[PDB]
Amino acid sequence: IIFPEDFIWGAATSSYQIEGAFNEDGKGESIWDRFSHTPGKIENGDTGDIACDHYHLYREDIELMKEIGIRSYRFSTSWPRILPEGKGRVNQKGLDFYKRLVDNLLKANIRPMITLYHWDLPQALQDKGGWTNRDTAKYFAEYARLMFEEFNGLVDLWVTHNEPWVVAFEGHAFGNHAPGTKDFKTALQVAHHLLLSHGMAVDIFREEDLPGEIGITLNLTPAYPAGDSEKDVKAASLLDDYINAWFLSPVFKGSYPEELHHIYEQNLGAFTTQPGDMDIISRDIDFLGINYYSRMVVRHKPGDNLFNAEVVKMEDRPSTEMGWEIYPQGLYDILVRVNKEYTDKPLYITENGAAFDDKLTEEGKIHDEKRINYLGDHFKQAYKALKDGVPLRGYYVWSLMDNFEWAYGYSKRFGLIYVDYENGNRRFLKDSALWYREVIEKGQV
Ligand SMILES: OC[C@H]1O[C@@H](S[C@H]2[C@H](O)[C@@H](O)[C@H](O)O[C@@H]2CO)[C@H](O)[C@@H](O)[C@@H]1O
Ligand SMILES: [Cs+]
């Protein structure tokens, strides 16, 4: 179990989850500022107002990155911190923060990967319809161009979008995430525009002629039927397409998955598209980022979804604090499936990790054995994928540090680093952090 010498071992975060400084130095309001300040939306009424205060503490966080020995740091940039209204004026202090951050990363020999959109849409753009407005895709493209030009020669790994499935469906169908809408047709229109905006950014990446590589990051959850019933098998297949193929087929094949597209259209009516959209959505990219956490086991059951599909709770199997099944085999399955059915391009696991009930000792120790076991077990499946020909180039752990976990607030801890919010926001390396350092150095698990 030795990994390639040049394998990119990293850790990942996102802007709203760690930065804080929510209305400081010219920053505009995001849909997540608004959502978290709306009653009943976040566990315990938590907000990302301060979070980990990374906006002020970034220099200390980079020292901690150095202690862990990560080769690359994946982070997202806040669109409303840079263009407060989404379009219009640039906020120079906002841009300046990311410039300092990138400079500091490069001086520590840490390779930056930027995610352009990790869910924090400017509220001014939401007031004009947000992702159901085709113009939002244009403004995203303009924001991308601004960042490409600013970091030309400085950042060589770029991700347009993080988890467009979640943005579309949790944000607009089920209303669990900002902006809180609950309309399945809206979600489908939003998915289309996220994909369009991705392709528009790729076109701009090519034109600007930056050194480096661009991709998109998709959450992928492989589905398994509960039993050999073909109704079970069909239901699993449909749920699987609903999360996975719905984004993988347009990016790589230039079409929505046919059976699912037909079912949506017949029952809901068509969402609005223009001729040529699929050509834009399917522009050639340099890599695919995969975010993996768990699988779903699926059976056929009466439900208020078009699939009559139920996700089965696997009560008999180890799970995390999220209640998610621990199923490392799924990581192998999904990497192999992508490489066979969709693309021969390089792959990166841009997220994988776990929440456990972390206990900070009086001396600042966190003995997170369960996270070490979780990470090592998934590392081994990644190795197995490499052994079998999958061009896996790197692996970023979610997350570098504990943070604002959206609707769960601070109650869920995914970090390699413990953040003691109550006591000056001090950081403590968990045992998994020093265990990870050993993995990176030896290239072995
Ligand atoms: O979306 C499901 C569930 O995910 C967890 S973890 C989450 C990270 O917070 C997000 O930044 C990353 O890109 O994706 C993973 C999976 O979506 C999140 O804490 C929780 O609120 C959310 O409901
Ligand atoms: Cs049909």
Numbering used by the authors: 4 to 448
Provide the publication's sentences verbatim.
The overall structure of the 451-residue large HoBGLA displays the typical (β/α)8 TIM-barrel fold adopted by retaining GH1 enzymes. In subsite −1 of the active site, the catalytic residues Glu354 (nucleophile) and Glu166 (acid/base catalyst) are situated near Glu408.
The crystal structure of HoBGLA in complex with thiocellobiose, HoBGLA–TCB, was determined at 1.85 Å resolution, and shows well-defined electron density for the TCB ligand. In HoBGLA, however, the TCB molecules folds into an unusual conformation to place the reducing end O1 atom within short hydrogen-bonding distance of the catalytic nucleophile Glu354 Oε2 atom. Considering the overall similarity of the active site in HoBGLA and PpBGLB, the striking difference in TCB binding was unexpected.
